[PDB]
Amino acid sequence: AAAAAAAAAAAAAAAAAAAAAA
Amino acid sequence: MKRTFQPSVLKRNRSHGFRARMATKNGRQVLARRRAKGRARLTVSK
Amino acid sequence: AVVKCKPTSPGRRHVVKVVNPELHKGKPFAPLLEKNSKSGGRNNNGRITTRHIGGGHKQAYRIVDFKRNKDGIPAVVERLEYDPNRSANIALVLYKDGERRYILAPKGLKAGDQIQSGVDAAIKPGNTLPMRNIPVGSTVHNVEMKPGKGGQLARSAGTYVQIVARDGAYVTLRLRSGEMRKVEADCRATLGEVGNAEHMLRVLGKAGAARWRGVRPTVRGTAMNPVDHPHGGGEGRNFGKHPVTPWGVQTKGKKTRSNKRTDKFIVRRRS
Amino acid sequence: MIREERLLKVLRAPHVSEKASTAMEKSNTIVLKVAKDATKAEIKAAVQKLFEVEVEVVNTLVVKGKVKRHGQRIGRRSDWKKAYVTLKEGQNLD
RNA sequence: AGGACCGAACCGACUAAUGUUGAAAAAUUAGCGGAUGACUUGUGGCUGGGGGUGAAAGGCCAAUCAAACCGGGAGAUAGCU
RNA sequence: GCUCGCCGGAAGACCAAGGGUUCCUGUCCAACGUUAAUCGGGGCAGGGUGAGUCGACCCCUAAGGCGAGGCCGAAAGGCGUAGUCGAUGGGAAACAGGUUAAUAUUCCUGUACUUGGUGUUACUGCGAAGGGGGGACGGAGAAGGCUAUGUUGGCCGGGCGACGGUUGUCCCGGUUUAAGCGUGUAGGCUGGUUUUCCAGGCAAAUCCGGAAAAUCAAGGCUGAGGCGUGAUGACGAGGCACUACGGUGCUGAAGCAACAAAUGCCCUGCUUCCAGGAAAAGCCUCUAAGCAUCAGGUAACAUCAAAUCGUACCCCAAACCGACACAGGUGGUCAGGUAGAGAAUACCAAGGCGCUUGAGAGAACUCGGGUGAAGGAACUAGGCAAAAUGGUGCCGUAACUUCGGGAGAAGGCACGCUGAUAUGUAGGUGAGGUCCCUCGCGGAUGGAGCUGAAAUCAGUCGAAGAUACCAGCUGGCUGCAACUGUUUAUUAAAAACACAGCACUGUGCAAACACGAAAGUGGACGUAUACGGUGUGACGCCUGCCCGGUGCCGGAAGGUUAAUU
Ligand SMILES: [Mg+2]
Ligand SMILES: [Mg+2]
Ligand SMILES: [Mg+2]
Ligand SMILES: [Mg+2]
Ligand SMILES: [Mg+2]
Ligand SMILES: [Mg+2]
Ligand SMILES: [Mg+2]
Ligand SMILES: [Mg+2]
Ligand SMILES: [Mg+2]
Ligand SMILES: [Mg+2]
Ligand SMILES: [Mg+2]
Ligand SMILES: [Mg+2]
Ligand SMILES: [Mg+2]
Ligand SMILES: [Mg+2]
Ligand SMILES: [Mg+2]
Ligand SMILES: [Mg+2]
Ligand SMILES: [Mg+2]
Ligand SMILES: [Mg+2]
Numbered sequence A: 001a002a003a004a005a006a007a008a009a010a011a012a013a014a015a016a017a018a019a020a021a022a
Numbered sequence B: 001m002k003r004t005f006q007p008s009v010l011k012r013n014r015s016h017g018f019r020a021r022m023a024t025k026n027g028r029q030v031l032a033r034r035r036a037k038g039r040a041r042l043t044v045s046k
Numbered sequence C: 001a002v003v004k005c006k007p008t009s010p011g012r013r014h015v016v017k018v019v020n021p022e023l024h025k026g027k028p029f030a031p032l033l034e035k036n037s038k039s040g041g042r043n044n045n046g047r048i049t050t051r052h053i054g055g056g057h058k059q060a061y062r063i064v065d066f067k068r069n070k071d072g073i074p075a076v077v078e079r080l081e082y083d084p085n086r087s088a089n090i091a092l093v094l095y096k097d098g099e100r101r102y103i104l105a106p107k108g109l110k111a112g113d114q115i116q117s118g119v120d121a122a123i124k125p126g127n128t129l130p131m132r133n134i135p136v137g138s139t140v141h142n143v144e145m146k147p148g149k150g151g152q153l154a155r156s157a158g159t160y161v162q163i164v165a166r167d168g169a170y171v172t173l174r175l176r177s178g179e180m181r182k183v184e185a186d187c188r189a190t191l192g193e194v195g196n197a198e199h200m201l202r203v204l205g206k207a208g209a210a211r212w213r214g215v216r217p218t219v220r221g222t223a224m225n226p227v228d229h230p231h232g233g234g235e236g237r238n239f240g241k242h243p244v245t246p247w248g249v250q251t252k253g254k255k256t257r258s259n260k261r262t263d264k265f266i267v268r269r270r271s
Numbered sequence D: 001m002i003r004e005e006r007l008l009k010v011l012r013a014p015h016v017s018e019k020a021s022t023a024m025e026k027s028n029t030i031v032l033k034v035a036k037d038a039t040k041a042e043i044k045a046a047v048q049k050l051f052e053v054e055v056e057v058v059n060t061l062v063v064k065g066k067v068k069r070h071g072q073r074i075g076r077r078s079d080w081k082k083a084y085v086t087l088k089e090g091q092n093l094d
Numbered sequence E: 001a002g003g004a005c006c007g008a009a010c011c012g013a014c015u016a017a018u019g020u021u022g023a024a025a026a027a028u029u030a031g032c033g034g035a036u037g038a039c040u041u042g043u044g045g046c047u048g049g050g051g052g053u054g055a056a057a058g059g060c061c062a063a064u065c066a067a068a069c070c071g072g073g074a075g076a077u078a079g080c081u
Numbered sequence F: 001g002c003u004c005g006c007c008g009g010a011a012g013a014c015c016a017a018g019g020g021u022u023c024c025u026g027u028c029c030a031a032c033g034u035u036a037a038u039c040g041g042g043g044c045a046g047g048g049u050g051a052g053u054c055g056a057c058c059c060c061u062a063a064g065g066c067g068a069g070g071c072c073g074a075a076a077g078g079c080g081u082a083g084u085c086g087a088u089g090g091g092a093a094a095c096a097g098g099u100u101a102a103u104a105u106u107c108c109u110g111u112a113c114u115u116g117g118u119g120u121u122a123c124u125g126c127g128a129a130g131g132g133g134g135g136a137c138g139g140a141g142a143a144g145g146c147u148a149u150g151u152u153g154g155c156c157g158g159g160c161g162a163c164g165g166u167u168g169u170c171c172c173g174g175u176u177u178a179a180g181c182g183u184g185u186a187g188g189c190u191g192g193u194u195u196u197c198c199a200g201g202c203a204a205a206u207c208c209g210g211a212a213a214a215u216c217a218a219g220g221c222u223g224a225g226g227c228g229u230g231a232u233g234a235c236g237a238g239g240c241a242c243u244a245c246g247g248u249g250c251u252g253a254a255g256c257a258a259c260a261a262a263u264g265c266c267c268u269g270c271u272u273c274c275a276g277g278a279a280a281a282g283c284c285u286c287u288a289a290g291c292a293u294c295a296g297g298u299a300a301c302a303u304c305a306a307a308u309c310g311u312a313c314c315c316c317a318a319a320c321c322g323a324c325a326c327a328g329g330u331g332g333u334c335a336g337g338u339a340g341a342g343a344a345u346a347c348c349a350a351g352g353c354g355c356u357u358g359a360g361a362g363a364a365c366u367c368g369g370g371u372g373a374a375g376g377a378a379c380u381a382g383g384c385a386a387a388a389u390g391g392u393g394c395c396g397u398a399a400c401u402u403c404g405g406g407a408g409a410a411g412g413c414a415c416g417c418u419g420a421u422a423u424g425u426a427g428g429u430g431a432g433g434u435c436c437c438u439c440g441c442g443g444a445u446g447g448a449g450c451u452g453a454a455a456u457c458a459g460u461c462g463a464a465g466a467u468a469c470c471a472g473c474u475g476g477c478u479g480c481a482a483c484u485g486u487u488u489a490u491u492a493a494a495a496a497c498a499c500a501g502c503a504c505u506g507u508g509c510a511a512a513c514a515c516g517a518a519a520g521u522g523g524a525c526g527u528a529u530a531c532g533g534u535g536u537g538a539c540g541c542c543u544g545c546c547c548g549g550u551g552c553c554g555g556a557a558g559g560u561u562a563a564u565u
């Protein structure tokens, strides 16, 4: 047989505003 | 969670279907575009 | 009358109902009813053209005479009924030849008396006769403006309007808001005030009756965000501009009557 | 009355099955396979004047065909109306 | 009689641990509030983007919103990388 | 195949909107199942849905949509009239049993029902795009009779119990039977009937509505359930047998009573409150344009007919939406026993599944959990967490107030089991038998049987008697908003917002204002005790000074000035 090659999830910009430096 | 799309054909095929897109004006400017590429699944009739 | 209720709950502390016990329960006399549901202020074109209207209970528009077309003939009243649409109480009447109509209740109309719509009418609270033939000083409600259009003057639940003088084919009307309006002699009229005059004593009491009556919660200004109303925002409670409507017109005293059309009838406005 | 030209087109074949091989004897019924524009008139007049035999009453349904995959590309077999035809008391086909 | 109380289904999302390339791109567990009403809900019709709708948070209008998304002038332009 | 686990208002059955061969056998293992694989919702081959009654289509309308004309707009188009479209609602019908490996209210015996044209039988006012009665309607609680089911007894069949008893007051199993057709029922509704009249219902009306007059005690409507009939049939505990030992064929008794009882029926009813609770058609009915002794009309019955399409399968899921066989998300239908108030929860049945990686050892540590010497908040931002309280009956219960609450305030006591009051009463149901009866599904009447709490008193047992599950932490002094509510789906429920009450101001109805350039449309089929705009937010006491800035209101002698000239 064969198969596809998935990609490109909605990666949520990989972060919140975690580094609160103020 | 209730998702993005909870199906109901009884409204889907009258709010997207062929006679709906033939009744207005610019639906005849989408049916006048899908044949340029020549869509074999022309619209959302099953 | 003004029946008070007691603190049995949160909320139910400031209610006062008005009971006129002569009003019958049962059913409204069916062949003068039709259907008029509410569009919540939404016009035909889909937007909102008057705000805060939506919700409430399903109401049926009683066909009401505002013409009293059957002149000359006599009639007697049959019943008094609770109107759903206007705040007044309506009177289910019996014409002598067999029809039934619905007349707004004069303050003396107990269940059982008689009315004589016509130019030959008695001077009693309940009659109807054109305005050549009212003797002046009288208390007249249900007043038209044109010879047969329909009554649009003093038609509310507690109003009444005075005839003050005459001049020729014109007669001078002191309305409830106190605007002297000259009007033609043929415009239809009645005698006495209207019935449920203690309606302005009734207070609502809780938010429930506001939603039942139909009025939605009106959003006040100064807490709205400053894009969607000109009383906008500001981190805190700041207001210091001029008080305006949502569409730029300032409100508190600014005239927005925008006619030069019915100047030649209006004598003088109020204070 | 249906004309003979329209009558003669309405059949393809009888239909072999286990439920045919039970309905043949234990309830004496036959299993047609008719064209898609066939009503109970176009089979009640069609079992009669094509085998010169009689009929009690007719029944049908619209079988929807399966989904086949020849090679790797999809395929949809043609639908076909299956007719159940009950024969009267004292009847026997050829 | 009750925007009355206690408490189910149903809603709702307050507290805490777990879970955070988890089972789930917002949830499990254990406690919680409303629970004959300004409720909740089935299905169906209506509201178009400087517009709608909004108990009005600048929240929501298909997981995207201080102007949705799909083509186009688009090879916008970038004196900065 | 046997144990053992677990759900059982779900993890059960049937369907909905959804999906498109997943259902059933014959195979087949490469890929697919977070493994192996004979197995699979996987490939491959075949088999599988049946109707006058269920549903769609169809007859009729709501919200809206389309909308010739017409009105309006640079054009497309925009609303909008007559119409014709528009289910989630209104209108014909029917059920019980058997069957296949799969469907079946659809197939089969059984027995019923409707709706259309027909031909005849006697009857001879039908006629309508029109007239009226109807369909026809909200919310709450409260009862009254009732069954679906449940329990027990009587009965019938089997068994005398692997180990102390267990031919007895013992144990098991079963005891079901429908629509339809007559029965007019507990009750609910409402006074009927002709005589003549009549500014009315668009015209006419023999129909409504109204005016009388006579005249009667009674006309129907409306209906759940139970009995009848459906019923010699079907099923039916199980025995009777061979075969493909999977199945199936052939037989078959009892089929009663009482009490309990709904969130299901009457009920679309009643009472009563205010926020005052669709239309149209099928139908009932009256008439004109039209009529002819015709036609049509219901009074009969032999008929003839009543399509097309959906029908398999899963349906709170491994089959839908979430990219996955994912602790997720969705609506309606039916609720079994036992303690409880109960659809909660607990253990169970009928049915279902035991969760697609499993074995082994028992480290730190993580998570979910049980208990703890002594001390009790010392911990810490803060009692966050955990613990603890928890149920009814009865006693008892403050300052404070708008008199309602606070309050379930606080704190207490009682309770398991057996026997007696009473061999199970107080309470209900209620046949025996008279009794009268307008004789019926009637009652006057009476107690058999049946079920039936708590109480009290005595005794006994436990460390512990609401023992498990279940099931409020409570007071004290405070800010803040009156509160019930609701919002940042996906970090913020708050002191935010919103509310009723008030104050102003606008608005004379072609309103005022808003969307649309307009047509119109809302406001409103409303009329200043109404609507819009803004301000603050219940009530309680209260709301003082200033018109210079700023705006708004009126006033117009002068200064000031366009387009024109
Ligand atoms: Mg649309
Ligand atoms: Mg307002
Ligand atoms: Mg207000
Ligand atoms: Mg602005
Ligand atoms: Mg400030
Ligand atoms: Mg919420
Ligand atoms: Mg929160
Ligand atoms: Mg939870
Ligand atoms: Mg509650
Ligand atoms: Mg409550
Ligand atoms: Mg805000
Ligand atoms: Mg903001
Ligand atoms: Mg969004
Ligand atoms: Mg934009
Ligand atoms: Mg833009
Ligand atoms: Mg260009
Ligand atoms: Mg570029
Ligand atoms: Mg269990």
Ligand SMILES: [Mg+2]
Residues within 6 Å of the ligand: none
């Ligand atoms: Mg299931």
Ligand SMILES: [Mg+2]
Residues within 6 Å of the ligand: D067, F021
């Ligand atoms: Mg397949």
Ligand SMILES: [Mg+2]
Residues within 6 Å of the ligand: none
């Ligand atoms: Mg299979």
Ligand SMILES: [Mg+2]
Residues within 6 Å of the ligand: F033
């Ligand atoms: Mg595998």
Ligand SMILES: [Mg+2]
Residues within 6 Å of the ligand: F036
């Ligand atoms: Mg292997």
Ligand SMILES: [Mg+2]
Residues within 6 Å of the ligand: none
């Ligand atoms: Mg298999």
Ligand SMILES: [Mg+2]
Residues within 6 Å of the ligand: none
């Ligand atoms: Mg398969």
Ligand SMILES: [Mg+2]
Residues within 6 Å of the ligand: D060, D061, F050
């Ligand atoms: Mg069929």
Ligand SMILES: [Mg+2]
Residues within 6 Å of the ligand: F051
């Ligand atoms: Mg059949």
Ligand SMILES: [Mg+2]
Residues within 6 Å of the ligand: none
């Ligand atoms: Mg319409």
Ligand SMILES: [Mg+2]
Residues within 6 Å of the ligand: F066
């Ligand atoms: Mg249109």
Ligand SMILES: [Mg+2]
Residues within 6 Å of the ligand: F068
């Ligand atoms: Mg046109």
Ligand SMILES: [Mg+2]
Residues within 6 Å of the ligand: none
């Ligand atoms: Mg139609």
Ligand SMILES: [Mg+2]
Residues within 6 Å of the ligand: F087, F088
């Ligand atoms: Mg429907």
Ligand SMILES: [Mg+2]
Residues within 6 Å of the ligand: none
């Ligand atoms: Mg319908």
Ligand SMILES: [Mg+2]
Residues within 6 Å of the ligand: none
């Ligand atoms: Mg039908």
